[PDB]
Amino acid sequence: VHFHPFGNVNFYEMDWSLKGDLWAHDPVIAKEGSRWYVFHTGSGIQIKTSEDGVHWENMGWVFPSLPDWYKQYVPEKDEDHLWAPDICFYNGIYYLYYSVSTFGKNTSVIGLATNQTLDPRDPDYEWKDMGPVIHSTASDNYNAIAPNVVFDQEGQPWLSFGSFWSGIQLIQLDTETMKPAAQAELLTIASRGEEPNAIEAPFIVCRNGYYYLFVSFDFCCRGIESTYKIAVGRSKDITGPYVDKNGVSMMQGGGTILDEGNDRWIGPGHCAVYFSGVSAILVNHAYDALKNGEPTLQIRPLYWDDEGWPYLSV
Ligand SMILES: OC[C@@H]1O[C@@H](OC[C@@H]2O[C@H](O)[C@H](O)[C@H]2O)[C@H](O)[C@H]1O
Ligand SMILES: [Ca+2]
């Protein structure tokens, strides 16, 4: 994956017994040179760095002070937590999308910050506020949060996002601006078909002629009472229809459950998937039942069966 570079590493041979500062929620990962980076939800977007991808250390944040334009979209927001960042590398630039919102409401806006490098030691290191990408108002039937960028086989960048309301949305981005055209069509590609519609945090990857849509089912943010689950569906066309193993459309609650946790790791969710050579990893957070349900970073090797469906090992 050119936009999610990891080259020169086999995730399947590594020991993923994470150590260090592992508190995280809605994480994504990027690697530049010998340095690994984690971006996740928190004040001004929290960052963690690692030498091997296993031992993590907190490394500050993206926005020391929130851009004033946030108020034009979410005037009621009072605190400085920015949610569910997404990172990708294109044309020598790092594109970091994130969410500005308030819990339980859809008055939200997805923003974009860019940097020439992820290394704070480099003279070119500077997170630039490149403004809003797409937003939702109370009158909209969707929620503009939890972005994920994917470049299809033809090199066309697409932005997927969404949480509750109508569900998962999809829209084309322009390669130059990396923002959707003013007249771009917004497409709904997945929904539980229930009320409330508990589906969010989309992440799309392409593997062997298929596009896989990973999403999170049910409830996050409730500590050991979270009911988060990771589900997946696929399609030959990035615009859908995404269908699960049983042939059920993801627009009708379809989705094959990849992980629903256990009595030790509660509600795993808001995932990300990365590849390297022939290996792949599943990234997400889960609530620690042994530690007051604190959200913890999880990285595990992700395999793919003969049918091409992903699965976690035992
Ligand atoms: O990330 C989860 C969080 O709650 C989601 O909405 C929850 C409720 O369902 C209905 O949509 C009600 O209007 C909400 O209160 C939000 O999308 C998100 O902030
Ligand atoms: Ca995400």
Q: Overview of this structure, please?
A:
- Helix content is 1%, strand content 46%.
- By secondary structure, the protein is mainly β.
- The chain has a single domain (1-314), classed as Tachylectin-2, Chain A (5 Propeller), CATH 2.115.10.20.
- Strands 1-6-5-3-2 form a 5-stranded mixed β-sheet, with no helix packed on it. Strands 4-7-8-9-10 form a 5-stranded antiparallel β-sheet, with no helix packed on it.
- The protein is globular, with a radius of gyration of 18 Å.
- It starts with 18 loop residues before the first strand and ends with a strand.
- The chain binds a molecule of 2 linked components (FUB-AHR) and calcium ion.
- Calcium ion binds at residues 26, 28, 84, 86, 146, 148, 201, 203, 270, 272.
- It catalyses: Endohydrolysis of (1->5)-alpha-arabinofuranosidic linkages in (1->5)-arabinans.
- Its EC number is 3.2.1.99.
- It is an enzyme of class 3 (hydrolase).
- InterPro entries: GH43_arabinanases, Glyco_hydro_43, Glyco_hydro_43_endo_a_Ara-ase, Glyco_hydro_beta-prop_sf.
